[PDB]
Subunit: 313 residues, 4 copies
């Protein structure tokens, strides 16, 4: 019979070819779906922020019943953060698919048009429901939790570096062989429909001879939470460790992640988490650990509980 209705929510510039005119930039979209577009905000992905996240999640939650699936156009710099936020806060189990482009739309061999096409194909496929928020880039379907950018410029940068992709797309057909095991979307307790702001969580970097001043500035300003981008398996330079130990004793939530791009920051391996009240991020990298910590702090300030959240989501 008929084609699904897919809504395209844009957050920034056009990635192909005016969100209302996408069907004229990529006319092949008409054969896959009845497409409607809305510009929700217009900003550079590098300036992505908590208000945009709250706005997007509310919009998807409210409009879930009116459409068969969503495609979100988003810049590549912070795609991985936005995707995990929505993966935790969207209560709609219809396909929510994010997509961007590594090359500008006017450039030779621009990747955006085919990325957009494939994203609409993903959002229109019934098998894509109930898998969480998805990122479609370079002929691959990736889950919002594991997905990250691995290269500054490559069209193939987006990968799920720990657990792999969910599926591959070839000629408008998707071979799914995986689905994420951690809880997402409608299975999480996080509800943002009444929040107009989120807890303050910052990130500090570790390295040889690291200054403690970044950590001290965040504590002095009353941050709710601090993520450490540790060295190796979440290790801290001594002055950073002293400042964070004190902070965690006096009510700051402290998550140990790693600057190292793959693998888990594991619980009491290098550092005695139970003694200091620290939380280990597992496979969440620093920027994703921030997202989960922010949301955890809307429900609890207890480190043992926060740790359990980091083991479930």
């Amino acid at each position: 019979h008929h084609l699904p209705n897919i809504t395209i929510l844009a957050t920034g510039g056009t990635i192909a070819g005016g969100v209302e005119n996408l069907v004229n930039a990529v006319p092949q979209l008409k054969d896959i779906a009845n497409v409607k577009g809305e510009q929700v905000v217009n900003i550079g992905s590098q300036d992505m922020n908590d208000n945009v996240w709250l706005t997007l999640a509310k919009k998807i939650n409210t409009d879930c019943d009116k459409t068969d699936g969503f495609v979100i156009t988003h810049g590549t710099t912070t795609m991985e953060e936005t995707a995990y936020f929505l993966d935790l806060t969207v209560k709609c189990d219809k396909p929510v698919v994010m997509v961007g482009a590594m090359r500008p739309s006017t450039s030779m061999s621009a990747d955006g048009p085919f990325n957009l096409y494939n994203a609409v194909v993903t959002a229109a496929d019934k098998a894509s429901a109930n898998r969480g928020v998805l990122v479609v880039m370079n002929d691959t379907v990736l889950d919002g939790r594991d997905v990250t950018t691995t290269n500054t410029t490559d069209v193939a940068t987006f990968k799920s570096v720990n657990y792999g992709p969910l599926g591959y797309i070839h000629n408008g057909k998707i071979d799914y062989q995986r689905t994420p095991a951690r809880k997402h979307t409608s299975d999480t307790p996080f509800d943002v429909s009444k929040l107009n702001e989120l807890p303050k969580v910052g990130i500090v970097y570790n390295y040889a001879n690291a200054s403690d001043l970044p950590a001290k500035a965040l504590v002095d300003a009353g941050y709710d939470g601090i993520v450490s981008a540790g060295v190796g398996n979440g290790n801290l330079y001594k002055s950073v460790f002293d400042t964070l130990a004190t902070a965690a004793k006096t009510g700051t939530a402290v998550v140990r992640s790693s600057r190292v791009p793959t693998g888990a920051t594991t619980q009491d391996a290098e550092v005695d988490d139970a003694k200091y009240g620290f939380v280990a991020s597992g496979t969440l990298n620093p920027q994703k650990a921030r997202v989960l910590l922010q949301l955890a702090l809307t429900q609890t300030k207890d480190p043992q509980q926060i740790q359990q959240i980091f083991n479930q989501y």
Copy 2:
């Protein structure tokens, strides 16, 4: 005729099996070289710092004539930083080889013994001279500039993620097919033999809704230089960009690197470097960009000159 003399400088705990007794932990070392060991410092790699670096570089430079090659035992967390520092400051063109272990020496299938063996094999091979400071891990020879840790726990974590390894080791023989093109060791102008400290350079992280407070703390404390771990191709969150723009106008050196684990942060692509007085790090990740910036600042505070250094070393 006879075996080379190799000196093993240790910075921390034993990686096999007491630096003087390594020849009893790995007796096969005797067949490859006449080995001597010295404990230079004893610290956790996560607490690595500028004084240790200055001490190591002086020691290698002074002792260069007394030995055929050096092996340095070092923890894995900051190996990649220490290696690049020495790659720029060591004036000895005999093999300088760093080595560590991802598993403790008492654990089942400890990687250290064979890593140590292979490191001594590398340091004893005449073909290893004139290639810069080398890291030997998991049967692979890696140059100190490109080498980084890719996984929190894997024995195979060390990779040269942009340009690849220099050689592979199989049965005590190395097949070298590459050598680094950027200038190293005795071809650089950096000389640390008279320095008892280095310029202050810190790192700030970018992410959605990033605080500018870490950057402001470093500027207020008079840091000489700031490396930004940007999003994508070295992009900055707006408040971080405003603070750094001001800082660079008033004499702080500012290098744009990326949190993204591979690829170059390229010069005037995303950001107008010439307008703001910023320097693009190319393929140096944030912690390595710090090392080069520190050394650049012992010779110049001019951004155009600093950029040229970042294009040569």
Copy 3:
């Protein structure tokens, strides 16, 4: 009350006979009651159909007598045996394969810790119902996707298209994935009455390829030929012509690829419908052989072989 784990050996020892293992790796005692048995003693590179049938029958038979199985197997052909077992084992208890890239007498031998992690894996209840597993280098990999990516590296084993199922740290496994394709007790393949498998060989494509290998297999009456194609399963002209003719005579022909990752997709490069060819999807040539052998025990029709290739 520790689980009972059976170790079935197929070759030499990977740590330190088969009942010496608890002496070689004393930490095993703390995690399982281990019993060992030497099923065959063969080098992995000489792995064959008989060993496969034997292993599947032993596991299917002893399923109710133990809580899980660890099979010690050499690394060269581990990926083939693992997938065969993945399709033919009807025990849904953990079945975990393990080997070693370095010999047991070498410095920093990988076998002991690998063996220890394999037993940890087979003893964990969360490992059941995931199909046949390979445990190497602290990683838990599914039998369909796992392949060896490097000739000598201890980290060689990877699931190159869809990734691992779990990682192991201090004896605990973080499972975040399970394979979607049907395995073990969900397959129709039953080897309990078979003493032999259909004959399936493999030919390689490259520039200026001889069609002689393909002709030698056709002339010998092979039931099936898998092509290790160039790119997206393409064939050198002369090999193509030999295989189009054999397909018309009822030889089953599967297009796979010499290229180490990605699917050989259906009807994209070659018109499979027209020549009666089957596309392997993500199965590399040696894995596509395994499935084709089994498919041929149920059917010789290409369209139904294609569907099997789309479900298992």
Copy 4:
């Protein structure tokens, strides 16, 4: 004064005949004076010895008439042609190969930007003396190590053992590496008088492997056989016995590996000295064929073939 770059085409067009290219990619005009010529018109999967000899002769002949060459070639066998040219081209001007993973009429076709970057590469003086290059997905790769890693991905081309030579950003190349093995004008191989190459075929190893492919090649008088071995170049028993016998009769036998990265090392698994076998090092089977063909134009002694395999 822009460089003169010649585009030699071997098949269809990768952007948009061969002189239409400057209309298809107008930005080329700003970086080079481009002349095009269609040397053959063949699908990459049917690539053969004749096309190789022709391309090497054309480049060797026209070397002094142009500043660099771009060769448009289909992706399936690009890695083979690139290495053949790398050993036989005596022009030390840039020779750059390029192709496309998506067809020119598809959405987000990769050929135009690839072609543009290839011409950029051939026009840059820093590209000379690095041997024959492949330029794909903003990356500059050497002809010996480059291989295709995925069946469909635009990013498929990688130098999987030693990495790329350079990356291209906004028309500038950051070169940080050059290949150490001898190439182009440093090799002894000269194809200028040859109308044919020695016959070298490829056999695959796997569990329960037939020795029929190997026998079909021996019986036909092949000069050389490359084995795509399991693990570190191992051979299934029956294939081993067939090839040990052929080696004794003077067939040249090279052990390579089906495993996609790492070296097939000398005397490690198999005693090469004793059977007269040669180990391929990092050359995969299809690349090892190329070098073996050329080695056989100078010598039939295994020890000297081994040395060639250790130098080129």
